[PDB]
Motif scaffolding. Structure first.
Motif, short mmCIF file in Angstrom:
data_model
loop_
_atom_site.label_atom_id
_atom_site.label_comp_id
_atom_site.label_asym_id
_atom_site.label_seq_id
_atom_site.Cartn_x
_atom_site.Cartn_y
_atom_site.Cartn_z
N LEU A 184 0.81 -1.22 0.06
CA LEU A 184 0.01 -0.13 0.10
C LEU A 184 0.83 1.42 -0.17
CD1 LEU A 184 -2.78 1.23 0.11
CD2 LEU A 184 -2.94 0.94 2.47
N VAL A 185 0.86 2.22 -1.07
CA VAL A 185 1.81 3.22 -1.27
C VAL A 185 0.89 4.41 -1.46
CG1 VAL A 185 3.65 4.13 -2.87
CG2 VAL A 185 3.37 1.63 -2.43
N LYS A 186 1.51 5.33 -0.58
CA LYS A 186 0.84 6.83 -0.73
C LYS A 186 1.97 7.43 -1.71
CE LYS A 186 0.41 10.82 2.68
NZ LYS A 186 1.37 11.48 3.68
N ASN A 187 1.46 8.04 -2.68
CA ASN A 187 1.85 8.97 -3.69
C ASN A 187 2.02 10.47 -3.28
OD1 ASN A 187 3.58 9.53 -6.07
ND2 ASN A 187 1.81 9.11 -7.52
N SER A 188 2.31 11.42 -4.28
CA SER A 188 2.44 12.68 -3.91
C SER A 188 1.90 13.51 -5.15
CB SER A 188 3.87 13.17 -3.42
OG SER A 188 4.76 12.76 -4.52
N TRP A 189 1.10 12.82 -5.74
CA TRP A 189 0.47 13.60 -7.08
C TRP A 189 -0.96 13.80 -6.67
CZ3 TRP A 189 2.02 9.42 -11.34
CH2 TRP A 189 3.30 9.81 -11.43
N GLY A 190 -1.42 14.28 -5.29
CA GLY A 190 -2.86 14.84 -4.91
C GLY A 190 -3.70 13.63 -4.97
N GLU A 191 -4.80 13.84 -4.54
CA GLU A 191 -6.00 12.54 -4.32
C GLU A 191 -6.63 12.16 -5.37
OE1 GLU A 191 -8.62 13.63 -1.05
OE2 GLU A 191 -9.04 15.69 -1.49
N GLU A 192 -6.65 12.98 -6.45
CA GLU A 192 -7.68 12.63 -7.57
C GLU A 192 -6.80 11.68 -8.33
OE1 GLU A 192 -6.19 15.65 -6.98
OE2 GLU A 192 -8.04 17.12 -6.15
N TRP A 193 -5.37 11.17 -8.11
CA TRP A 193 -4.74 10.35 -8.85
C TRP A 193 -5.10 8.90 -7.80
CZ3 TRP A 193 -0.81 6.81 -6.97
CH2 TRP A 193 -0.40 6.25 -7.94
N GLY A 194 -5.12 7.79 -8.76
CA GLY A 194 -5.04 6.73 -8.12
C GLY A 194 -6.44 6.44 -7.47
N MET A 195 -6.02 5.84 -5.97
CA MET A 195 -7.27 5.52 -5.00
C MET A 195 -6.98 6.46 -3.84
SD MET A 195 -8.78 1.95 -3.73
CE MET A 195 -7.54 1.05 -4.97
N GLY A 196 -7.73 7.71 -4.24
CA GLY A 196 -7.66 8.77 -3.26
C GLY A 196 -6.02 9.12 -3.07
N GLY A 197 -5.19 9.15 -4.15
CA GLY A 197 -3.71 9.10 -4.07
C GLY A 197 -2.87 8.01 -3.68
N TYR A 198 -3.41 6.86 -3.46
CA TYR A 198 -2.71 5.58 -3.13
C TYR A 198 -2.66 4.74 -4.31
CZ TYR A 198 -2.29 6.88 1.77
OH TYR A 198 -1.90 7.41 2.72
N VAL A 199 -1.81 3.75 -4.21
CA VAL A 199 -1.82 2.80 -5.20
C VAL A 199 -1.28 1.35 -4.51
CG1 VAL A 199 0.70 3.48 -5.57
CG2 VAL A 199 -0.46 1.85 -7.05
N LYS A 200 -1.99 0.37 -4.91
CA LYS A 200 -1.67 -0.76 -4.39
C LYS A 200 -0.72 -1.55 -5.52
CE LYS A 200 -6.39 -1.63 -3.00
NZ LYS A 200 -7.42 -2.50 -3.61
N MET A 201 0.59 -1.73 -5.05
CA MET A 201 1.54 -2.13 -5.96
C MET A 201 1.96 -3.66 -5.71
SD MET A 201 3.25 0.66 -7.51
CE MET A 201 4.90 0.32 -7.70
N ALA A 202 2.25 -4.27 -6.80
CA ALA A 202 2.27 -5.67 -6.80
C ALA A 202 3.44 -6.16 -5.63
CB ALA A 202 2.71 -6.39 -8.16
#
Ligand SMILES: *[C@@H](C(=O)O)[C@H](O)C(=O)N[C@@H](CC(C)C)C(=O)NCCCCNC(N)=[NH2+]
Length: 220
Positions: A184-202
């Motif tokens: 479970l990864v928190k990105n820094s591209w705002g909450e409109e990207w991905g799942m509220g700003g998060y990505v589930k990485m393999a």
């Protein structure tokens, strides 16, 4: 280790931020990991200043909007003796001269720990330490358009990473291909990207996108 971990439920993680059009991902990853370890120490979650790092951590090896490393950020905080809060030193998405003020410092660290380059070691660190700074290969259109599910990109590199993010946990969910584990990864591209700003990485797929290849956290 546990099969599932999520540090957001334990209060370790600030809301998703947006780095804008500045190559400052390393600073958002670093502030995320240090926010976690400061909360672990003090019980208080305080959003920290990425601009402080962009403007001031050049002597440790960072280059502002042109790139940087989370470990160099952790060294700056130690060398400098502090780091200002987001509220006191807000993010402007452009490199300017250093304006650090020790009176408004809210964080410190005494170094950092690099995790061995194995997903098994990353898992143990996430399970026992808190959110972990990591580097991934995010240079694919599939990463830009990600909306949900477990992200897997067959052309991802495990050695050429270009984007700093924050592992806040891991887990699983059933899928067509039975590759069910994810970081479970928190990105820094705002909450409109991905799942509220998060990505589930393999997860546990041959160190997909290099997620375990440059992992670290600060010592508070
Ligand atoms: C990341 C972004 O804004 O998306 C930004 O381009 C960045 O800082 N990239 C880093 C890669 C890390 C995984 C964040 C980068 O390419 N710069 C690192 C320079 C450090 C030089 N030394 C070593 N050992 N690479």
């Amino acid at each position: 280790a546990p099969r599932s971990v999520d540090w957001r439920e334990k209060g370790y993680v600030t809301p998703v931020k947006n780095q804008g059009q500045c190559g400052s991902c390393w600073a958002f990853s670093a502030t995320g990991a240090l926010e976690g370890q400061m909360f672990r120490k003090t019980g208080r979650l305080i959003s920290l200043s990425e601009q402080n790092l962009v403007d001031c951590s050049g002597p440790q090896g960072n280059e502002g909007c042109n790139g940087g490393l989370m470990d160099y950020a952790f060294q700056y905080v130690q060398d400098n003796g502090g780091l200002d809060s987001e509220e006191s030193y807000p993010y402007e998405a452009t490199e300017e001269s250093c304006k650090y003020n020790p009176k408004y410092s809210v964080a410190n660290d005494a170094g950092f720990v690099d995790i061995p380059k194995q997903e098994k070691a990353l898992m143990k660190a996430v399970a026992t330490v808190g959110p972990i700074s990591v580097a991934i290969d995010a240079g694919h259109e599939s990463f830009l358009f990600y909306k949900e599910g477990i992200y897997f990109e067959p052309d991802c590199s495990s050695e050429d990473m270009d984007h700093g993010v924050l592992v806040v946990g891991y887990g699983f969910e059933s899928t067509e291909s039975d590759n069910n584990k994810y970081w479970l990864v928190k990105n820094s591209w705002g909450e409109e990207w991905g799942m509220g700003g998060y990505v589930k990485m393999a997860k546990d797929r041959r160190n997909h996108c290099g997620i375990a290849s440059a992992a670290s956290y600060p010592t508070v």
